[PDB]
């Protein structure tokens, strides 16, 4: 109640602490990269259109608002 | 490929079928006029020369047949 309530537990505290390795960090990072390559696409397409029916693309300080 | 492949085409599709007007139609009707009006010579001409071995023409049911 006060030994093997807590003793027994003070192992199995650890022995299950020790052995739970989920995973790593920064591989959220990674996925920065394929959010931004997956934009590249979208932009650039997303941009022919207006390249399209104005014929032509938006200046810099009309930026990307323009679309 | 779905879009820039398309989109892009269908503008192209319009843009080129609405500006191409070839012509009108009725025109051969005016040439049957000169193709009849051509066998007016070409007819009493050629009737002539029998109205000229046998001295004149033939015959409503003998027909330009007998030419």
């Known amino acids: 109640f006060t030994l093997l309530e807590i003793m027994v537990?003070?192992?199995?505290l650890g022995v299950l602490a020790?052995?739970?390795?989920?995973?790593?960090m920064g591989n959220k990072e990674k996925a920065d990269r394929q959010k931004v390559v997956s934009d590249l696409v979208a932009l650039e397409g997303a941009?022919?259109?207006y390249k399209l029916?104005?014929?032509?693309?938006?200046t810099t300080e009309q930026g990307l608002q323009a679309l």
Chains 1, 2 share one sequence.
Not at 9 to 12: D, F, L, M, R, S
Not at 18 to 24: A, I, K, R
């Open 9 to 12: 537990v003070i192992v199995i």
């Open 53 to 58: 029916d104005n014929s032509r693309y938006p």
């Open 47 to 49: 941009l022919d259109m």
């Open 18 to 24: 020790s052995l739970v390795v989920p995973n790593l």
